[PDB]
Design a protein around this nucleic acid. Structure first.
Lengths: 234, 230, 191, 171
RNA sequence: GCAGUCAAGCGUUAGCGACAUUGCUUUUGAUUCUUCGAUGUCGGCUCUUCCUAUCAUACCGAAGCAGAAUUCGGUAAGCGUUGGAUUGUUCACCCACUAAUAGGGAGUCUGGGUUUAGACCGUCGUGAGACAGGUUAGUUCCUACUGAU
RNA sequence: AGAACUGGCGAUGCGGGAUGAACCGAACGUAGAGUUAAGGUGCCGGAAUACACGCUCAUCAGACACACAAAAGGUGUUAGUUCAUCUAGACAGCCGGACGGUGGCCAUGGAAGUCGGAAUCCGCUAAGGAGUGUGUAACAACUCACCGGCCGAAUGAACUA
């Protein structure tokens, strides 16, 4: 297959791939941190906002946490008994179902669990989850916030996003003289309904982040006791 | 009339539904269309298409190289900065222009049997002292259209060409009778008024004339090129 | 490189059952019946399970291998149409002249009729292809709905209906009257 | 062609006071002993200059296939100069015997690269005994477990100029 | 073109060299009033035939194309491409009307002229003699197609 | 252009090259038998529509005094060289992150990264460009440079015939 193969759309940018060097650095960091701190915790961060993660890091900067590829992190912790860096460390790795998010610290379990339980932040719909609340787009002139606000002050939607609504959000709409308008109100969400990608994108565009994401933890590891307790918070 | 409003109308009707989709489909089909045309565009068109493609590829390569180099990271006075910038002749053993049709024969008289006339088909410089003699004496004829007074002059220094009057011709090889005739005959050495450059030899005696050799062939070109023998 | 064996797997739901002799393919399901001819393609079908069907090419080339991956796609599309059903929506918008659309019963063929397009007096007619039912998109301002079993027939009908409203010798940027496909989907909604 | 394997050796005829010089042995495939000897001298005059007058063939012996019944893969390295100059090339061929593999390689080279017998120089041929040695799909394709495939569009030559049965593919 | 410049590649592998690139290449829509020895017979009438490197009509396409109308790439030879004008040479330019009044080859009735007619003015020579010009006088059924027995 | 040198025509029949006064072969009386050089073995044209390895889709390919419009180009085909990605999950496909000082500094009614322009920092990490683009009066709105959630076994880049 010399010719007619798939072409490329490479674009010039001031950034390059880190390559295997970053993976090796993460491996070494995980290995060092395993013995650096008495307590090791696993945090699931499949979908988390960058500012929230930065704020969490700053709150307990001393309680440094190392993140990376799930498979790479599992290899660093040791998936098998003969590969574990520490005795019975594979139990923590096995319970790591989500994306870690390996936290190393010294404070007792009570402090960590209280911090996890007492913290919660708003988040997008994140489809495959129950609808946080019902929402229907009002008719007439539309607004950037979806109309669930004092629309008398809200700025009308920009014309540039009308094609996005037609194609991306898949919401039938028409174009009017000055502002985007719809002939009839179109429902997009309802209580207890499993949302879809289109609904999530629409909610994110309207800024209705009625959902609330919270840190998820599955277990932790004790350096001395060499035992893993399947602590869970919901 | 009615300045750029068309943008306003586009903003009030917003990118007709099929326009974006059609544009995207055309852009996707652009590669296939170019590949197909690489086989189409037959004689007198495929050559131009290939030349354009080669130029585009060279430009893309040079732009990629510049980006890659950038991603890695003759003193002049304060008033000249930020401003635009073994005695063998350069061309020995010139082509041996033979004594041939170049001395074109023009038939004279109503009955063309006593021409006796020869015409020089080579560029020649004479100057003010031409003074065409009576027609009966025109044994050799140098046409006016083929006479040039200013020849291009250059030197491997600053690459500046300036048209200068031709002063005279001193030595034309290959039967210098041509020298006596004043013909250019590329390979000749001619004097040129170099007063424009104003180069001054040792002793403060400003020079304004130097001998230069014709580089280009004025017979096959409408311009005369020479290089200063400095 | 002249692959000795190449094939693909086709999943047939229990709601339909196909029969493949020499390459004329009949499809029967809850949404009616469909047929297609594939003799020209020169491929071979093979049954490995009651719900799975395989198509294989022996000692073929890239030009012939590509045929397999499109025959599989066509079979999948036919199965979905006979089971899921294909629905097409085509909205039309007019600036000044109110466009009128009606399904005239002339000659039985039921040609799609359009009038008052940009004020043009000439009547434009487009035949309704077999296997696709034309219906109006009630509750949707100025929109028509097309659906059926054959994807190709519906797509060709929509293409003809949108091309018949072409604008000539006019700036497309300023001229907006026409027929544009809204979106592509299925009759079910929510199957 | 139906080449044969000949063991060609040289001696660099002994100069005075230097009896029994170094002996060099070469494995080469040729249709006859004369061609094998000529190729031996051609390679000798390239690896280390020794002319025909200054050398001679110690002996020539035909090498028969050790096991001309086991089907095996063969790794072959090929070098040729056409149209461009010298450049290395590697190929993998599955055949019963080394001579058959060499013949198939020569035919494939002639078909694809238009190379000639003199333009092709045999470098090394190594037998394969286990998987993971072959690195190309077109050879690995035949190593699949229980490989099966029919012959499509089978046709048979007709002895008679005309047939009344309207012969069809069999099937 | 000349002399460089960057240097995709080949290099004895110090030199070459594709594409770009700098200097010739009245900065205030000013007016150059410029149009410089074509030594040759061709020039113009009608009709037919062939090409597209096509002017209109036809086809569709890209445009600050909003229309009118305009700039241009491409398909297309189907049908059209008219009329006056100089000569103190018509190696060519003007403007009536149209949608346009496209470019060539295959030469084929008429007029300059390509040639000895006879003469003249001046050139050149002691002269016959011929011209750097020029004017006058001029004479050049065999085969194939269309109808019929 | 010019020199010495070799062969044929010159003075020449014969087979083939559609035909060529310079090509390939070839030691010219009259006949018979058998084997060849050159050309071939679908018909004119006497001889396999012979075997075997592959290529060739060509809008007038290809069978062309081999001579140059000939250098590249084809998301056309067949075969090979080098460098990296790799089950510390190969390429490609669906989803999220794409931060914080910051709305950098001078230009100034607007340049919040995408009308001007100098460097392009430090804090920060799995990763973030004082920005690649689409589009806005002004951000805003969306994509990748780069990373992760699923997949699921070889992949991407430059060259040669």
């Amino acid at each position: 297959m010399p010719r007619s193969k798939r072409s490329k759309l490479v674009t010039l940018a001031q950034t390059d791939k880190k390559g295997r060097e970053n993976k090796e650095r993460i491996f070494d960091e995980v290995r060092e941190a395993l013995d650096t701190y008495r307590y090791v915790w696993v945090l699931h961060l499949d979908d988390v906002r960058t500012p929230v993660l930065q704020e969490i890091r700053t709150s307990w900067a001393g309680s440094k946490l190392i993140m990376g590829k799930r498979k790479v992190l599992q290899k660093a912790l040791g998936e098998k008994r003969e590969e574990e860096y520490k005795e019975n460390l594979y139990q923590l790795s096995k319970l790591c179902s989500g994306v870690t998010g390996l936290l190393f610290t010294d404070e007792d379990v009570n402090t960590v669990k209280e911090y996890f339980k007492s913290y919660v932040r708003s988040d997008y719909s994140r489809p495959n989850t129950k609808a946080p609340l019902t929402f229907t787009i009002p008719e007439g002139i539309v607004y950037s916030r979806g109309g669930q606000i004092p629309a008398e002050e809200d700025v009308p939607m920009i014309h540039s996003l009308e094609p996005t609504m037609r194609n991306k959000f898949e919401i039938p709409t028409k174009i009017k003289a000055g502002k985007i308008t719809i002939d009839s109100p179109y429902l997009v969400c309802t209580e207890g309904e499993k949302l879809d990608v289109r609904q999530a994108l629409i909610l994110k565009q309207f800024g209705i982040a009625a959902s609330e994401f919270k840190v998820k933890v599955s277990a932790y590891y004790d350096n001395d006791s060499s035992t893993v307790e399947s602590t869970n918070i919901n | 009339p009615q300045n750029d409003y068309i943008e306003r109308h586009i903003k009030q009707h917003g990118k007709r539904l099929d326009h974006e989709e059609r544009k995207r489909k055309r852009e996707a089909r652009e590669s296939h269309k170019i590949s197909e045309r690489a086989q189409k565009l037959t004689g007198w068109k495929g050559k131009q298409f290939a030349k354009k493609r080669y130029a585009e590829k060279v430009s893309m390569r040079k732009k990629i190289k510049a980006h890659e180099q950038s991603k890695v990271k003759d003193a002049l006075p304060t008033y000249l900065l930020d401003r635009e910038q073994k005695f063998s002749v350069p061309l020995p053993k010139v082509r041996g222009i033979s004594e041939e049709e170049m001395f074109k024969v023009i038939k004279t008289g109503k009955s063309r049997s006593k021409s006796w006339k020869r015409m020089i088909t080579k560029h020649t410089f004479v100057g003010e002292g031409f003074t065409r003699r009576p027609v009966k004496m025109e044994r050799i004829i140098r046409p006016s259209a083929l006479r040039q007074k200013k020849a291009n002059v250059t030197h491997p220094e600053l690459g500046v060409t300036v048209f200068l009057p031709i002063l005279a011709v001193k030595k034309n090889p290959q039967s210098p009778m041509y020298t006596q005739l004043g013909v250019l005959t590329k390979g000749t050495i001619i004097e040129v008024n170099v007063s424009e450059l104003g180069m001054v030899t040792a002793g403060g005696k400003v020079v304004w004339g130097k001998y230069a050799q014709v580089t280009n062939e004025p017979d096959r070109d409408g311009c005369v090129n020479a290089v200063l023998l400095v | 490189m002249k692959y000795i064996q190449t094939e693909q797997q086709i999943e047939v739901p229990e709601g339909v059952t196909v029969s493949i002799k020499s390459r004329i393919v009949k499809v029967v399901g809850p949404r009616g019946t469909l047929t297609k001819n594939l003799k020209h393609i020169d491929v071979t079908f093979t049954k490995v399970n009651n719900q799975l069907i395989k198509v294989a090419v022996h000692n073929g080339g890239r030009k012939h291998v590509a045929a397999l991956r499109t025959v599989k796609s066509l079979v999948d599309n036919m199965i979905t149409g006979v089971t899921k059903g294909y629905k097409y929506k085509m909205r039309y918008v007019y600036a000044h002249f109110p466009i009128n659309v009606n399904i005239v019963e002339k000659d039985g063929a039921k040609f799609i009729e359009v009038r008052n397009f940009l004020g043009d007096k000439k009547i434009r007619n487009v035949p309704v292809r077999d296997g696709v039912t034309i219906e109006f998109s009630t509750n949707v301002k100025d929109e028509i709905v097309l659906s059926g079993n054959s994807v190709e027939d519906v797509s060709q009908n929509a293409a003809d209906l949108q091309q018949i409203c072409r604008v000539r010798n006019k700036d497309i940027r300023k001229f907006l009257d026409g027929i544009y496909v809204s979106h592509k989907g299925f009759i079910t909604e929510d199957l | 062609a139906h080449f044969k394997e000949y063991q060609v050796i040289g001696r660099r005829l002994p100069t005075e006071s230097v009896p029994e010089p170094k002996l060099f042995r070469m494995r080469i495939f040729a249709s006859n002993e004369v061609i094998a000897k000529s190729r031996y001298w051609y390679f000798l005059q390239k690896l280390h200059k020794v002319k025909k007058a200054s050398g001679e063939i110690v002996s020539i012996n035909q090498i028969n296939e050790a096991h001309p019944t086991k089907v095996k893969n063969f790794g072959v390295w090929v070098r040729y100069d056409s149209r461009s100059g010298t450049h290395n090339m590697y190929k993998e061929i599955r055949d019963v015997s080394r001579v058959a593999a060499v013949e198939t390689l020569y035919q494939d080279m002639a078909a694809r690269h238009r190379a000639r017998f003199r333009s092709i120089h045999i470098l090394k041929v190594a037998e394969i005994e286990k998987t993971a040695d072959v690195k190309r799909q077109y050879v690995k394709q035949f190593l699949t477990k229980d490989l099966k495939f029919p012959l499509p569009h089978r046709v048979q030559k007709s002895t008679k100029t005309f047939s009344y049965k309207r012969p069809s593919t069999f099937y």
